[PDB]
Design a protein that fits this description.
Elements (H helix, E strand, L loop, with lengths): L12 E3 L12 E3 L5 H4 L10 E4 H11 L6 E4 L5 E2 L4 E6 L7 E6 L5 E4 L21 E4 L13 H18 L3 E7 L5 H10 L4 E2 L2 H7 L11 E2 L7 E5 L5 H10 L6 E8 L16 E3 L2 E7 L6 H11 L3 E4 L6 H18 L2
Parallel strand pairs: 1-2, 2-3, 3-4, 8-9, 9-17, 10-13, 10-14, 11-12, 11-13, 14-16
Antiparallel strand pairs: 5-6, 6-7, 7-8, 15-16
Bound molecules: nickel (II) ion.
Nickel (II) ion (NI) binds next to loops.
């Protein structure tokens, strides 16, 4: 049964709640972004409206095969009426096509649902700057002060450096990048750009990328593996046995892989900086982990909430145990007492 933090009061609206069957009274099912925990349940056989971004729509039509009529894409940053309720979609700074949703209730209540987000100061000069938000449904993935990690522009620096080094030292080395969902495209696009290459990938991953409205995408990517020296691979595959396997397939065209596993937080963030990173090494294969996050750090989250001064906060992540719920409330109370709301 749909949990209360997936419903919007005073509406027929639900958010990311596609895995319960029909939801009694739900006229509309919102989807914040194309990640399988949030979309779990959608298919070709859905015959209720789905509101989402244009990009999320393309993924719905082409990857899940939902029928065009039931996909209502909406522009971002545009005041839109939906069953006689004003709503706005705002960029979530998560993956491609990921949005937050502003709901303007008839009664005067304003609600913000963040979806998955990486909070940023540019969100403080958006349409949110113009009015008061009473309820906040918040991505709490990293709501604990241990969770620090670098900026995305810092990570893209390291990456561009490491790869452009090794390839200039050894011009017969391959760059590999791990992946298992949309997100983090900047990692491989930036490396390929510094190397003068296209990124090569499976057909299914090519298909996914062709849905994302990336400008000039036809010049950046290929299904011809042979022609490319930045390859993508399933994240499951990014290990020694699997990289050996893959290094066989390229047929004596490269003599060294240099891989990147973009990850979120891991416990080695607590002790080691990004400039002082190293890889595991079993022969000529070298696997880097790099903490490129598309979720708010604790400090980023804290700042966004303290600016927003919401009257109430409803977590959407780590809500499954009383211990986590309890820890989170304590942080929300501190933030409130510091900031005076
Ligand atoms: Ni996500």
């Amino acid at each position: 049964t749909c949990p209360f933090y997936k419903k919007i009061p005073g509406t027929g609206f639900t958010v990311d709640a596609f895995q319960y069957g029909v939801v009694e009274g739900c006229t509309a099912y919102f989807l914040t972004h194309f990640h399988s925990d949030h979309y779990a349940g959608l298919s070709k056989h859905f015959t209720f409206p789905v509101y989402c971004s244009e990009i999320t729509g393309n993924l719905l039509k082409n990857k899940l095969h939902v029928q065009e009529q039931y996909i209502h894409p909406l522009p971002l940053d545009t005041e839109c009426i939906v069953n006689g309720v004003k709503v706005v979609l705002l960029d979530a700074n998560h993956c491609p096509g990921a949005v937050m949703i502003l709901f303007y209730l008839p009664n005067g209540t304003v609600i913000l649902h963040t979806g998955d987000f990486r909070a940023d100061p540019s969100m403080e000069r958006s349409l949110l700057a113009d009015q008061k938000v009473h309820m906040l449904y918040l991505d709490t993935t990293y709501c604990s002060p241990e969770y620090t990690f670098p900026s995305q522009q810092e990570v893209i620096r390291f990456a561009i450096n490491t790869a452009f080094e090794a390839v200039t030292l050894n011009p017969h080395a391959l760059v590999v990048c791990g992946t298992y969902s949309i997100g983090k495209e900047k990692v491989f696009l930036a490396i390929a750009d510094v190397l003068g290459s296209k990124v090569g990938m499976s057909q299914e991953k090519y298909k996914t990328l062709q849905c994302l409205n990336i400008p000039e995408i036809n010049s950046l990517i290929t299904t011809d593996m042979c022609s490319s020296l930045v390859h993508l691979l399933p994240m499951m595959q990014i290990n020694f046995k699997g990289l050996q396997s893959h290094l066989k397939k390229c047929g004596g065209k490269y003599n060294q892989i240099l891989a990147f596993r973009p990850t979120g937080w891991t416990h080695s963030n607590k002790f080691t900086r990004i400039a002082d990173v190293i890889p595991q090494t079993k022969g000529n294969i070298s696997i880097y982990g790099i903490p490129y996050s598309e979720h708010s750090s604790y400090l980023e989250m804290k700042r966004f909430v303290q600016w927003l001064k919401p009257q109430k906060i409803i977590p959407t992540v780590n809500v499954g145990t009383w211990k986590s719920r309890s820890t989170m409330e304590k942080y929300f109370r501190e933030w409130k007492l510091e900031a005076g709301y």
